[PDB]
Amino acid sequence: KGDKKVIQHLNKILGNELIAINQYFLHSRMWNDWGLKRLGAHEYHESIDEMKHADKLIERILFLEGLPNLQDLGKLLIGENTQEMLQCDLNLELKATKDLREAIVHCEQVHDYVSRDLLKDILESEEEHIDYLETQLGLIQKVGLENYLLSHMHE
Amino acid sequence: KGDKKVIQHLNKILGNELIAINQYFLHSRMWNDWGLKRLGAHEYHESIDEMKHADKLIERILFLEGLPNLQDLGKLLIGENTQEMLQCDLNLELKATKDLREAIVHCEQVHDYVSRDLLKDILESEEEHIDYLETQLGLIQKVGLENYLLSHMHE
Amino acid sequence: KGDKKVIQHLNKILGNELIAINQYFLHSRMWNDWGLKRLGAHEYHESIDEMKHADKLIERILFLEGLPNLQDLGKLLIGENTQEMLQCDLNLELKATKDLREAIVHCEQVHDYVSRDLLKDILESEEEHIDYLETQLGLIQKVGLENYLLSHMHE
Amino acid sequence: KGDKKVIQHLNKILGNELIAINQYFLHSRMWNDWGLKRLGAHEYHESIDEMKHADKLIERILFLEGLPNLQDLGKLLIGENTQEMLQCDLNLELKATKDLREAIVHCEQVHDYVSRDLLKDILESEEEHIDYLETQLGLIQKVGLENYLLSHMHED
Amino acid sequence: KGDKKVIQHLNKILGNELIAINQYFLHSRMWNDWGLKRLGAHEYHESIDEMKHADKLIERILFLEGLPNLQDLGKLLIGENTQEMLQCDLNLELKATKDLREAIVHCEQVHDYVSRDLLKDILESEEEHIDYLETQLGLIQKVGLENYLLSHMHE
Amino acid sequence: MKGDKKVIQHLNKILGNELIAINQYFLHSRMWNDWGLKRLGAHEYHESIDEMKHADKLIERILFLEGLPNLQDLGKLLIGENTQEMLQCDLNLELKATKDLREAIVHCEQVHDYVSRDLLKDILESEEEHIDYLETQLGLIQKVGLENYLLSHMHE
Amino acid sequence: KGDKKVIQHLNKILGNELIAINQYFLHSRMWNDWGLKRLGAHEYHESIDEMKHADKLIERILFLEGLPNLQDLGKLLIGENTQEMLQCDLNLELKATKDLREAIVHCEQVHDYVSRDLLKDILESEEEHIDYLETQLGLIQKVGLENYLLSHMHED
Ligand code: HEM
Ligand code: HEM
Ligand code: HEM
Numbered sequence A, B, C, E: 001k002g003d004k005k006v007i008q009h010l011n012k013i014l015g016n017e018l019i020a021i022n023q024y025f026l027h028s029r030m031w032n033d034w035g036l037k038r039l040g041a042h043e044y045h046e047s048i049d050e051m052k053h054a055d056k057l058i059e060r061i062l063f064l065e066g067l068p069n070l071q072d073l074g075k076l077l078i079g080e081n082t083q084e085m086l087q088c089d090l091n092l093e094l095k096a097t098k099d100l101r102e103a104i105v106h107c108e109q110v111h112d113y114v115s116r117d118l119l120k121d122i123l124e125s126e127e128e129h130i131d132y133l134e135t136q137l138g139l140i141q142k143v144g145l146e147n148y149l150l151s152h153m154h155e
Numbered sequence D, G: 001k002g003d004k005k006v007i008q009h010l011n012k013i014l015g016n017e018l019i020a021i022n023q024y025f026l027h028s029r030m031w032n033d034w035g036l037k038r039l040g041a042h043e044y045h046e047s048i049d050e051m052k053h054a055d056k057l058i059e060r061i062l063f064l065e066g067l068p069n070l071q072d073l074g075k076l077l078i079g080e081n082t083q084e085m086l087q088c089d090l091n092l093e094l095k096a097t098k099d100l101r102e103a104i105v106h107c108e109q110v111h112d113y114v115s116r117d118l119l120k121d122i123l124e125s126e127e128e129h130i131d132y133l134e135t136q137l138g139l140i141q142k143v144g145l146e147n148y149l150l151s152h153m154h155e156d
Numbered sequence F: 001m002k003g004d005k006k007v008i009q010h011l012n013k014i015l016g017n018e019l020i021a022i023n024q025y026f027l028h029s030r031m032w033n034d035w036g037l038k039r040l041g042a043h044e045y046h047e048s049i050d051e052m053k054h055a056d057k058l059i060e061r062i063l064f065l066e067g068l069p070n071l072q073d074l075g076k077l078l079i080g081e082n083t084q085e086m087l088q089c090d091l092n093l094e095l096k097a098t099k100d101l102r103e104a105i106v107h108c109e110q111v112h113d114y115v116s117r118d119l120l121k122d123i124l125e126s127e128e129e130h131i132d133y134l135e136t137q138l139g140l141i142q143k144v145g146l147e148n149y150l151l152s153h154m155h156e
């Protein structure tokens, strides 16, 4: 059986993935509705990536004889325009990585090194998303909003 | 022999398709003349799609032993710039979908379910065109008119 | 800008093409409705050919800074049986070639040699259609109406 | 579980399909026996098409927990010559589409939209058959009977 | 012209084939509905084989200048569970082969050797079906009903 | 062309049902995989994917109609504790889903939103196919016994 | 021998082609130097097309037993920025087509129909270049100069 606090941490990370799946999927379809197809496609792939993380977390929790929690869905940060949507994704990711670091600390302490390795792989993927997000927000500043949107119309 | 009012409704839809064929073809060639080749190509494909709908309507009318009316051509809405042309297409499509809905109501009432199915397929295609048009008009607001035209110069 | 009377002549030829498109398309679908698929298929190709001429005329008018007229649709000559439909097509083409010759005369007078060359190419296509029509009407006389229809049932 | 009257309508349409299978299959083989191979082949495909509709109806009735009725075979309309055979097929199809419309009305009323969609697909196929049949009868008038039969001796 | 009693015999065998087509097709679709897909698929192929026999019988009757009887449909033996359905198929086949033998005797007596050969080919197919049916009923005894059904779940 | 306000409410209701089914079927899939019932785990995975695709189409339709898709409200997951309960939980969810779909289609018809009706009818056919699978599986447990049924679903 | 005035007209058109070859080639390389590679590539192709017209005129003059004049090079219209370069090309083409029409009139008058056909083919190609140039100048007005240049930085 797994450590009770490891399973709590894994369920907390899973909860964050479930928010991100839905937030990124809606943002993707919003961008597609507006004709910003390059943003819509990239955001769809971000949503798929979170779906795959959730899958791996669910599988680990079950192996450890815990109960995966897919019932509690936290608050989606839905923006009303491109700049707010990107900032909402970044705010979500900054919370996501804080929780990941706390979970890894606990895994190391109780010697659950396989759970730590899984979380470290998720953390790397979220830091890559932060890299993308900070880059997009900087580009809006460097080229202007209307030029940035123009750049993201075509796939 | 088909229901007389069904044939009248089908000839009304056909009349709307005939307006749309010519309006979209002219808009296409105006955009090509101006060097906005992406818009010209998309609009050509819209005109072709209306040609295919008119064909299916003609065939259905003849099967029902009615007389297809290709003689009466209503008013083309020709715009003077890119935004107005898109808005003219949208005004035409909003009228077309109203007429399609009224035609479908009558087909259902007289149990002409095959005519209804044909009209619903056309209606879905016209709503996809509305989706394109509202998206383009929204992009003009979001990226600016000159940027929008810039994006539609090359195929 | 193009010559004002050249553009009027090009719009007149365009109007003739627009009549022919619809007349041949309806005749095609009537023959298909009747199971005369060889005639229906041939007439369909005649309609497509007039569509392509209309396109070239629209493009030339716009280059010359004129306004293509797709709004005014003249009288369709719709037959009620095969022999009448063929004679109607022949009557329309004889009017078309008369107008083409008058347009070519004017283009030569004002030295619009490229418009003349475009119109000469259309004229050759219309004379090929006259060749087909006169041949079909001659076959009806040579084999009889029922044998002619029999020959045109299968594609 | 399915609506009882929906299941009754579906079995009624199934009964019509079972008549058409047999009528078209026999007309097909009669035309082949006479050397009118183009007619025989087309009529064979109409029979196969009805077999597929009957299959989908059987499958739907079973899903809805009804009993498919393959026991009751109504009256086959068999012609004695080509012109009669085509009119017999047309008469059968006109009855079939009347029954299809009444079944669709009832499915709509009780919100069985999937059964309605199946019946609408069958109806489109039967109306295509009416188009073929009315066209053939029109051709007999336009070219004459002997020329029409001549046109249908060889297959495509 | 064919012998009158040969034509009666052929119409009787055809009548048996028409029963089997419907009985096997219904049994096939019942097994599919229950998820016994191996039984459903095999029973489908049995129905198709009887359809082909009916076709050969119809063609022979017409060649002999008889009237094929597709109007009279005898009693379908429909079971309520797998063991009853298999026994119903066997009962039908035992009657079918009895009738086939009587038809062959009469064909031999009147020297209709081509009709005899066709009927013998059908008889061989029906005995192959009896072999299948007796083998399945024996397997139910040897492995038990639940194991037998388990074996026929997957195609 | 703004959507009917009640149409958008119905579409958001169906979307909410799809979101429950995605999570319920995904968890059931991974439970069956954890238990080594790989054939059930794989089939249930594909059911979850199918609901994801329906949710996508509903989100797209709502946005086109200028509504706000609701991905925030997640209703109650019906999670079973063994194979037979899990299948019955899926079936209970699907019966509720098809009831809501029928009511949404009724309203779409009333306000002449025929494209939304067609989308919902396509989803309805897919959910009725899932009901077919589930009722068949529960019938097989009764026909072959629970242990034989589980044995049959160990290997993919 | 050919008609003396026909040969003079053909040499006049040849002279116009020789100006255009050099003007378009230099404009092409100026655009490439500035990093406006789409304009540079298009203008290179315009220069090649004029070289091919010059070739056909030389061949026709020699067949007619005239002397092709490749010695006299008239005034190149070289712009100092993109907008001036396009207008310089347009000014040259409007002069070229005027001379082409005058040459065709004369060929018709003396019944040199093959020379007329050659000149009409050149005229169609020059009117296509006018179409391109007017469209580009219009695009500058519709998108603004900086956006137009932006659109022409990268080749296809
Ligand atoms: C202003 C009037 C029209 C113009 C300028 C026009 C132009 C065209 C052109 C350029 C094509 C492509 C031909 C090719 O290159 O193969 C085409 C195709 C076609 N047109 Fe038209 N057309 C017109 C009216 C119509 C009408 C009134 C109908 C029917 C009633 C129609 C039916 C069709 C069909 C069925 C095709 C083939 C589409 C496909 O399957 O790809 N057209 N048309
Ligand atoms: C007089 C009765 C029938 C005759 C003579 C007949 C004849 C045939 C024949 C010759 C074939 C083609 C077999 C092959 O060579 O592959 C066929 C196929 C088929 N039959 Fe029948 N049939 C009859 C009744 C039925 C009935 C009552 C049904 C269903 C309720 C049915 C369902 C089917 C199906 C589903 C196929 C396969 C069609 C395809 O997918 O191509 N048949 N039939
Ligand atoms: C518990 C939440 C979810 C989980 C665990 C999950 C899991 C997955 C997985 C594992 C895949 C396959 C990824 C791959 O390897 O390519 C997938 C695909 C997909 N998901 Fe999800 N998903 C969830 C929620 C959602 C939601 C809420 C939506 C839409 C609103 C959605 C839409 C999609 C779509 C469109 C695909 C691609 C399906 C295809 O076309 O093949 N998913 N999901």
Ligand code: HEM
Pocket: G018, G021, G022, G025, G048, G051, G052, G054, G055
């Ligand atoms: C003055 C009279 C000229 C004539 C009659 C002439 C003729 C031609 C011809 C016939 C071609 C081949 C075209 C083809 O079919 O692809 C050609 C190619 C070419 N020309 Fe000229 N040309 C002339 C002047 C020039 C000048 C002044 C330049 C440069 C400053 C030039 C640069 C080129 C280049 C780079 C090619 C392509 C060579 C290759 O890479 O194959 N030409 N010319």
